[PDB]
Structure 1
Amino acid sequence: SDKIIHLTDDSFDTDVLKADGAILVDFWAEWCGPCKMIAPILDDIADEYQGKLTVAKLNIDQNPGTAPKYGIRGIPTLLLFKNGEVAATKVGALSKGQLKEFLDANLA
């Protein structure tokens, strides 16, 4: 919570679907080891990608509604949205190097 949008099921439309640009949503849970591995990396990305995209996190236990809409099974799942439409999907943990390459390739 500096640049990261802490999303809810009620805030999801406004925060993600109505945003004039790119949003990287992280579907995640507290018990999930790989999710917690990538949190510090998302902190990094949010800073590094100022003005290019916003990072948003949706905890799928506290907010149960949203994930079934996007077919999410494995977590973490990262969905790159561009103006409310999903452009790119990444399932499971990955490094900062790997995530940057994912974003750079798909933001274009």
Structure 2
Amino acid sequence: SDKIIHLTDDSFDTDVLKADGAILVDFWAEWCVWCKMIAPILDEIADEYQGKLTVAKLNIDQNPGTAPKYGIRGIPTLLLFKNGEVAATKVGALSKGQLKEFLDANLA
């Protein structure tokens, strides 16, 4: 978790929208089992994509206003931002091999 960024509705603008470089955001919740299952995968990817990517999480339970703006229908949902615009999205849990493929298809 040392390579993951914790966002708040507040910090969203700065840390994601104004952010320079690719930002992968994990919209999740407390009592979502699938959310808990990808947490470790998110750790590894983070470590492997340092310099190229910033991995960040958003607990919609404690940050209820961001999701809606993005059409978030269910969790976990992963949003890949670029230059303040969402570049790609993935709904639901996936493996590390999957997450990798998904980024690679988007990483410049």
For residues 28-87 of structure 1, give each alpha carbon's deviation from its aligned partner in whole angstroms, at most 9, with x where no partner exists.
001001111000000111100001110010001000000000000110000000121100
The equivalent of 1:36 in structure 2 is 36
What is the DSSP-based 3-state SS (H/G/I as helix, E as strand, rest coil) of the residue aligned with 1:2? coil
Runs of 4+ displaced beyond 4 Å: none
The corresponding residue for 1:78 is 78
Q: State TM-score, norm by structure 2.
A: 0.97
What's the % identity of the aligned pairs?
Answer: 97
Specify the SS of the correspondent of 1:106.
Answer: coil
Match of 1:55 in 2: 55
Alpha-carbon distance in 2 for matches of 1:103, 1:37: 19
Show structure 2 runs of 5+ residues with no match. none
TM-score normalised to structure 1 length: 0.97
**Residues 3-49 of structure 1: CA deviation (Å, up to 9, x unaligned):** 21100000000010001110000000010011110000001111000
